[PDB]
């Protein structure tokens, strides 16, 4: 009953099971630990970062090793459009003979790989199960490096100080230039040297790379300035990927669009992209000042940025010390940027597939988009939660105020009511009218008169599609016109490739849109606005409100303030995160439902099914869920089973976890404490069991813990059931 | 970089004078015990108790390897594979083309014998109050003192004799595995070569 929460003496003195539960959930909140200083905080965070990167590299190495050992990578190379990639083998003693037979792939039961790693590794120039093994070996070596570094930087003479940790200019210069630019430069080097010849049949391994010229002229044009030579003779339109037939000699080109065979971006396009990004980031990494008297001091930049007329208060004067001294502000900024970035990855890796033969891998396309959108929602909610935490525990009004006037951040708490009221107005506006149009379509179609539907053509979005060259909406605007200056400017660089790809019905590049797209985009906007409303309200109201003008004195996460003053359930800022998680899950569900139904109709060919039935709710319920759930639920029946049996089991498992979350959310404490007391009496008053007694007094889960557990069940069930549905439906419908 | 100190003066390494002399074995033992208590206090890790137990097991296993070689040579060690219909799909190793290669029955029998011996060990582990030599160290008990580079030359059924023979057997197993890995033959093939041919005859 002691010594487990070593970091908290208050918990270690708890005589109940709450100590164990809270010991887990407070282990990473280093700022709240006993005998805590800032130096130890930054050093522990640094070591934890090292361990985390080691974990990531070990996970990647495991994926590589299991593809190399139990996969069919080599067979998939020779026939990427017919051979289904294998993730890893299965050894489960609970299998019957039927399950073994159904999951049997080649030599052993195995799982199909939906991560798209086969296409990614094939694109970057891997052709052998020994190339994957080398990658796994190297990644385990890197993990060992990172673990050694993490141990080393906790040693006495190697523990960095607060000044080093808060040295913003040095870290920015190095991160930008070194990390981004130099990693892009090295990736361009690999892309060219290995990937470009490997796509043309020439093997460039760790033996013949110092003697195989990536370009026939060989670094002469680069120093000579004749950089056009690297773009001459690109890959033809009859080039077979991985073979020298119809190949070229160029290494950096503009082509635009996709490879005619793999239906993916040109490797020479991506090498040029990464070279340009490398140059730009290396240049941008010299901005801030270091030991050589030139550069920028960001404190001065922030302080000097006050509009002269005066509408942002005193400007950004106090922001430097605010961000530097707070790890939650930086964490929130990083999480918001990462969420936007992974939303970008999801939205671009389906419209512009970058890996060979990934466009025809429909289950992996759906899985990748869903995975990245869910990660995006999680990251955004985390960014807002950490902003709220910064408000609660790191924000100092004195730093952000100069002689009564407030800086740009402190002024966000002055018109907080205006911000929240207008977020509420936008949410109500969008919800009222999107639901009104959807229900109008529902009722009108149900009454057998679909012509009375309200169908709004998304002209604004179709205008953008025409601006990028789509000649489908008869707009003749910028790139849909051959005479506009936008078209004449790039008529010789990348329009022929771009136009040939955007004006193609088999791509996902700028999918044609209609009224259903309009309505679902408005639903998405409503979801985004409502999630933002909840999170922003929790962040701004974190330090106090009218119901609790001292909420900052109770911390970020507390159960309530009691039944007084009318009742104060879910009044903390943590509860705002807890409520906004449901809205994030709902919004990501809407986004992924829209994407998956649109792409299922596109792949099956019945795009008229979406364009007609997507305007009313029953259309969704009947033609997406009810229609495509048939293959999934018949993964096992009283007659047999298929390789989709695991997905049906996961479907039911997700439903069960969802409803257990419903348990933990609807039923609150107090009802579970008295029942536990009855159980305690029963155990204490029964023979043959009195010999065994608990060391920690069994008590009901706390209010905040119960909310967390219900949210965890809700989210896990949500994710599992939707993953099972999307994967099984795609597999069982599209062969 | 220049206007500040990367490492504070208050956080600097101090040379541990407590390990002066203290040959690498003593230094390693002290470092392990200080760094990992509650597993060192149990006798686990680089400890004389663990060394003695592992030596006993290595000697018994040299005996077991000789017995296994004899059984393989003398027509024992049942033939074929396990019945998947009888023992489920967990005994199936691979399916090449329409035939299920299962775990060899000889491997199953050897695993059952090893299970017998390991069960005996587990009973002795959860029988601490009735066994002559316990597996772990009692709280308070102190680990027997390391024997050193060369244990005392005391012939017979002595602690030093068992200690020396356990070290020799463990080194022999290490050498056997190293020879098998370097050259590439089976473990029993290496033992057969190292016995002239008198085992697999």
């Amino acid at each position: 009953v002691y010594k487990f929460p070593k970091f908290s003496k208050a918990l270690a003195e708890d005589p109940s099971t709450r100590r164990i539960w809270y010991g887990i959930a407070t282990a990473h909140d280093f700022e709240s630990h006993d005998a805590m200083t800032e130096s130890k905080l930054y050093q522990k965070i640094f070591a934890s970062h090292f361990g985390h990167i080691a974990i990531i590299f070990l996970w990647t190495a495991g994926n590589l090793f299991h593809v190399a050992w139990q996969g069919n990578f080599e067979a998939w190379i020779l026939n990427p459009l017919k051979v289904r990639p294998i993730a890893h083998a299965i050894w489960d003693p609970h299998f019957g003979q039927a399950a073994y037979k159904a999951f049997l792939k080649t030599s052993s039961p195995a799982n199909l790989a939906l991560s798209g790693v086969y296409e990614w590794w094939y694109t970057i120039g891997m052709r052998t199960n020994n190339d994957l093994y080398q990658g796994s070996f190297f990644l385990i070596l890197l993990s060992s490096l990172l673990l050694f570094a993490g141990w080393l930087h906790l040693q006495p003479s190697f523990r960095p100080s607060l000044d080093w940790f808060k040295a913003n200019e040095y870290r920015l210069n190095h991160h930008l230039s070194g990390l981004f630019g130099v990693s892009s430069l090295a990736w361009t080097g690999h892309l060219v040297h290995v990937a470009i010849p490997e796509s043309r049949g020439i093997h460039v391994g760790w033996d013949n790379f110092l003697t195989v010229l990536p370009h026939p002229e060989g670094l002469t044009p680069f120093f000579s300035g004749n950089w056009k030579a690297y773009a001459q003779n690109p890959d033809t339109a009859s080039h077979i990927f991985g073979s020298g037939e119809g190949s070229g000699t160029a290494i950096l080109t503009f082509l635009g669009g996709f490879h005619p065979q793999t239906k993916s971006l040109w490797l020479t396009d991506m090498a040029h992209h990464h070279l340009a990004i490398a140059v730009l980031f290396i240049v941008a990494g010299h901005m801030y000042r270091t030991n050589w008297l030139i550069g920028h001091q960001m404190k001065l930049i922030l302080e000097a940025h006050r509009p002269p007329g005066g509408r942002l208060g005193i400007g950004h004067i106090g922001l430097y010390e605010t961000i530097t001294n707070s790890l939650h502000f930086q964490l929130g900024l990083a999480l918001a940027a990462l969420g936007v970035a992974t939303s970008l990855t999801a939205q671009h890796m389906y419209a512009l597939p970058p890996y060979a033969f990934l466009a025809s891998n429909f289950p992996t396309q759906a899985a990748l988009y869903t995975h990245h959108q869910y990660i995006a929602g999680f990251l955004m909610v985390g960014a807002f939660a950490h902003g709220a935490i910064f408000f609660v525990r790191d924000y100092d009004p004195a730093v952000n105020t100069r002689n009564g006037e407030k800086n740009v951040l402190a002024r966000m708490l002055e018109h907080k009511e205006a911000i929240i009221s207008h977020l509420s107005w936008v949410s109500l506006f969008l919800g009222f009218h999107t639901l009104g149009i959807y229900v109008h379509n529902d009722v009108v179609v149900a009454f057998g008169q679909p012509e009375k539907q309200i169908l709004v053509e998304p002209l604004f979005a179709e205008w953008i599609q025409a601006a990028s060259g789509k000649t489908l909406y008869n707009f003749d605007l910028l790139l849909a016109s051959s005479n506009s200056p936008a078209s004449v400017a790039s008529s010789q660089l990348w329009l022929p490739g771009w136009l040939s790809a955007i004006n193609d019905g088999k791509n996902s590049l700028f999918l044609p849109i209609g009224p259903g797209d309009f309505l679902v985009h408005h639903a998405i906007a409503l979801g985004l606005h409502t999630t933002t409303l909840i999170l922003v309200k929790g962040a701004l109201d974190a330090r106090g409100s009218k119901l609790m003008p001292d909420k900052k004195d109770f911390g970020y996460s507390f159960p309530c303030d009691g039944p007084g003053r009318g009742g104060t359930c879910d009044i903390s800022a943590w509860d705002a995160f807890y409520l906004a998680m449901f809205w994030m899950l709902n919004t990501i569900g809407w986004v992924t439902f829209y994407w998956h139904w649109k792409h299922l109709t596109l792949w099956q060919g019945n795009q008229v099914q979406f364009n007609e039935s997507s305007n009313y709710i029953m259309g969704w319920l009947r033609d997406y869920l009810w229609l495509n759930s048939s293959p999934l639920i018949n993964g096992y029946n009283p007659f047999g089973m298929n390789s989709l049996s695991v997905w049906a089991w996961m479907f039911l498992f997700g439903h069960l976890v969802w409803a257990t979350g419903f348990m933990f959310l609807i039923s609150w404490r107090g009802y579970w404490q008295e029942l536990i007391e009855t159980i305690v009496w029963a155990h204490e008053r029964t023979p043959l069991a009195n010999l065994v007694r608990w060391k920690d007094k069994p008590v009901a889960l706390s209010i905040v813990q119960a909310r967390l557990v219900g949210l965890a069940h809700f989210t896990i069930g949500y994710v599992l059931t939707y993953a099972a549905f999307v994967i099984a439906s795609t597999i069982g419908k599209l062969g | 970089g220049t206007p500040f100190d990367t490492v504070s003066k208050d956080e600097l390494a101090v040379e541990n004078k407590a390990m002066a002399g203290k040959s690498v074995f003593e230094r390693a033992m002290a470092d392990f015990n200080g760094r990992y208590p509650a597993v060192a206090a149990l006798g686990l890790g680089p400890s004389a108790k663990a060394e003695r137990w592992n030596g006993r097991h290595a000697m018994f296993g040299w005996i077991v390897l000789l017995a296994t070689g004899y059984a393989q040579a003398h027509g024992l060690l049942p033939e074929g594979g396990m019945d998947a219909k009888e023992w489920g799909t967990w005994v199936i190793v691979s399916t090449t083309n329409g035939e299920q290669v299962t775990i060899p029955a000889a491997r199953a029998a050897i695993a059952i014998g090893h299970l017998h011996f390991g069960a005996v060990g587990v009973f002795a582990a959860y029988s601490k109050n009735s066994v002559k030599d316990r597996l772990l160290l009692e709280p308070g008990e102190k680990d027997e003192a390391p024997a050193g580079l060369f244990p005392a030359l005391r012939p017979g059924l002595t602690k030093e004799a068992e200690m020396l023979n356990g070290r020799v057997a463990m080194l022999g197993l290490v050498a056997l595995v190293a020879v098998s890995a370097a050259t590439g033959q089976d473990i029993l093939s290496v033992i057969d070569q190292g016995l002239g041919g008198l085992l697999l005859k």
Binding site: A47, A54, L58, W69, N130, F137, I140, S144, L147 | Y36
Partner: peptide, 30 residues
Amino acid sequence: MIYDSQVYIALVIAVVASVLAIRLGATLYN
């Protein structure tokens, strides 16, 4: 198909990465 030697040494290297992980884990304290 990878050999027994390839998998074995990868397992051995994985063990070394494990001992480095507990050293980091124990250094981040109990």
